[PDB]
Amino acid sequence: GSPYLITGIPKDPKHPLPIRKDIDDWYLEQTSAGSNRIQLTLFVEALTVIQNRPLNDQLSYFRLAGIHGAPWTEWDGVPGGQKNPTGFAVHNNYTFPTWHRVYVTLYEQVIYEAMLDFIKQNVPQNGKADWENEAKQWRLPYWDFARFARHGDELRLPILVTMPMVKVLVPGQPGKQLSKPNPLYRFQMQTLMGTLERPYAITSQKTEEHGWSFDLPFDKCQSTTKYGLLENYNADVWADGGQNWLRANLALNEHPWYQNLDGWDSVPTLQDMTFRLLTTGGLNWGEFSSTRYDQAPKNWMNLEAIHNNVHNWVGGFMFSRPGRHDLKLWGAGHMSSVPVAAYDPIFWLHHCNIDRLTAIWQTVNSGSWFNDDKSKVSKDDDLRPFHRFCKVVFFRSDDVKDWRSLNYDYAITKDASRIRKEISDLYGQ
C-alpha cells in the first residue's frame, strides 16, 4: 500500500519521546528476572514475520534491505536500476547522515507495525493492553560500537547478535519460554541469493584487494556472513560462511584503519576516534558528515569515515588470502560491501548508532547544519525513495534535523545538560 508514509512510531501522549536503548543494556534487562521479557519477544517475533514476507511485499526484510543497494529495484513506486549500478542510499555526500536517519526510522516503524499485528493475533485479550504498551515504548536499539562491553577493556558485537537462537515468551504462559532462530543473527533466503526470481537476484560484487579485482561471491550465499567468504574455498562453504563474531571483535579492537595515518600523533582506537568525533570543536556540517569534504585532517575522522571502517571490521574486508600478519583477520562478508551490507541485521543497529552520533554532534554543534559553502548545495536534495505527508512529497534533510519529530530520542541527547560528561564517561580515555 503506497505511498508508504514514513512517520516514525505514532505519538501516544502516555509515551513521550521513547528512547532507542543500547542493545546490550536492553537485552540484559529483558532477560533479567525483573523484566516481563515482552519487548524482546515482540522484536524477535516481529522481525521474524518481516523476514518471512515474500519478495513482492515491499515491507519484507529483503525489500527493505534492497532499498540500500543490490539488487537495485524500485521501492514504493520510485524507480530503481540507476547507473555503474547503484541504489537509493547516499554515500560520499553531506546527506549521508540524513538519508540514513530516515532509512532507520522506516525499519523501526515497519517492525512496530508488525508487533501490533503479532499482539492482535497471539496475545490473550486481557494481555493486549500490556503488550501494546510495551510495543509503544519500544524503539530500535543501537549498537554502541565505541563502548566497552560489560564484563561482570574490549569492544564487541552485540550479545544478541552473536546468539544463533533466542528464547521468547509464549503469551499467556508465565512458564513457557521457547527457543527460536534469532532473526538478528543473520538473514537467509530459501535458496542461494543469486537464484532469486528476476529482478531480485543478488549478483557477485566487484572489489579491489591489493590492486587486483575480485568477485565477492554473494550470489553463492544463502545466508549473510561475517568473514566467512575466503578465496579458494569450496562454494558450499560460501552458502553459509558463518557469523564469525570473534574475528569481527578482533578487528574492532585492532582497528586496522584503511586511511593513511602518516604524520598522526597516535593511532587512535575506535573508541578514541569516536570520542574525538563528538568533542572536536569548530567543525562545520560538511566536515562532520561526509568523506566528500576532502590534505585531509589528522588526529580526527569524520562520521562517514568511521562508519566505513566499522562496516569493514564487522563484515570482513579480505576475500583473498593476505600476508602472514594479516591472516588473523582473513575473510569477507556482507557488511563490508555497500551493495549487500543492509542484508546483515546488524546493519540497522550500526546505523542506529550512526544516527545517535549525529544527534549527539548536532546537540553540541547546534549552529552547523548544511551551512557551509560545500554542504549547502545538497541540503534540499530529495531523499528518495522516502515519502512523507507535507500533499505527499519526498523527505528532505531539513524535515529530520529534529529527530524528535520522528518520535524517538536517545538517553544521551534527552539529558543534554550532562552530554559532555556522558561523552567523556563512555568514550574518554
Added chain:
Amino acid sequence: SPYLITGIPKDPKHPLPIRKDIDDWYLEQTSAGSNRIQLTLFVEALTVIQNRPLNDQLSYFRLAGIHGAPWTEWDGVPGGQKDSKGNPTGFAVHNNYTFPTWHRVYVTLYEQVIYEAMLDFIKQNVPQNGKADWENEAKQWRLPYWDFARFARHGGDELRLPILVTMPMVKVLVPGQPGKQLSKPNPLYRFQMQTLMGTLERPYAITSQKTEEHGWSFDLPFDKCQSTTKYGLLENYNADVWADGGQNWLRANLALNEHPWYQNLDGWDSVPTLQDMTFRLLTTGGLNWGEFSSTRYDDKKEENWMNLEAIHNNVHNWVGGFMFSRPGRHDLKLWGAGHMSSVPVAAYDPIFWLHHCNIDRLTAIWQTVNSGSWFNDDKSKVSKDDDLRPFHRFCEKTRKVVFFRSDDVKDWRSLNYDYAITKDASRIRKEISDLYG
C-alpha cells in the same frame, strides 16, 4: 548388551574397503556430478544416531560419553574411574601406551554403529529397485579421516578443518525420487542436546570442567552449553552466548597454521609446522612402540621430533580452542575455548571422530614402516595385555564374550577397513614424502 564390536561385516564383494580423506570423499560425492549416496547415508545415519535418547547406549551422546564426561556406565561396564589427579575420568586411555589401540577400537565402534544405522535407513527409505545400489554403497563406505597435516586443495598451501565440518547445512538425495535433493542440518557441523548439557537427567549431566591456563585454575563452563563449540567460550561473556558459542572454524584454521605447540621446544633445531612434525613422526628411524605411542614414555618432554599422542594433544587444542581466560594482547587473535580441547567433552564434537580416524591412520602408517615395534620395549610391555574397557568382543577361539586387548587390533584389517596409503608397502615412503615432506 553386550554390544559385540567387529567392524563392518565382511562382504565378499567388498574386500577391505578404505577409509578415505574426508575432503577427497566430499568432492568425490559432490563434484563429479551428484554421486551423493554415501554422503546421504552418512548424514542420515548420523542424524538418527544423534537423535536417539539417552537410554539408548548407541545414541551419539552415549557413544561420546564413553570417552569422558559424564563418566557413567556403558555396555554394562561401570563408571566411577579416577585419573592421575584423582578426578573423575572416562574409559579413554590418555598418557599410556595403549592410547592408539584403545582409540582404534573406539573409532571402529562408531563406524560400525553408523553402518548399522545406514542399513536401517536403506530398509526404511530406499525403494526395491534401488536397494542393491544403496546397499552396495553402504558396504563400501568407511569412516573418513581428517588429514590435519595435508594442505587443503584449491578446487594448496595451508591446513584446514574439513570442508564438510564447516558447513551448517548439507544437501542429500531423496532415495524415493532420483533427481530430487534436500538441504538438511549437517550432523558433522556440531552436536547439541535439547537443553543445556548441565541440566540433563541424572546421571548424565555434563559439569563444568577444571583446566589450568597460565598456572591458574578455570572452570570451563560446558554445563552451560547446549551445543558443542569451537573457540566460542570466553571468560566474562554472557552465558547466553555460551549456550551455543558457534563453530569458529576460521580461528581453528589460524591455529593449525600458526602451530602454537604447548611443549617446551627450547634448543630444538627448528619449530616445525604441523605438517613437518607429522612427517618427522612417520619418518624418524630407530624408535620403539613406547616412544611413538605416548607421552608416558618420557615425562620431561611434556614438562627433534614429537610422539603421536603429543601431536594429537596439540591438534585437539587448536581445533577446539584452548584459551578460556583472556590472554595478553599479543595473543588475542586465538582467544576462545571449546569442546575439542577438553578431554572430558571432546568426543561430543563430531570432528573428534574424524581426527581420531587420522590418528588411527598415522598409527597404521607407522606400524607399516616399523614392523615388529609393538608393546615390546621395556616400558610399554606391561600395558600390552590391558583390557580395553568397555569394548566387548566375541572370542572365536574360546567362544566367550571378552574385552578387546591391543593384540586384537594390531592388524587393523581384521576390523575390515584399510587406508589407501597402507595398501602398497612399496609406495608408502614415497607417498609420505609426497603428502607431508
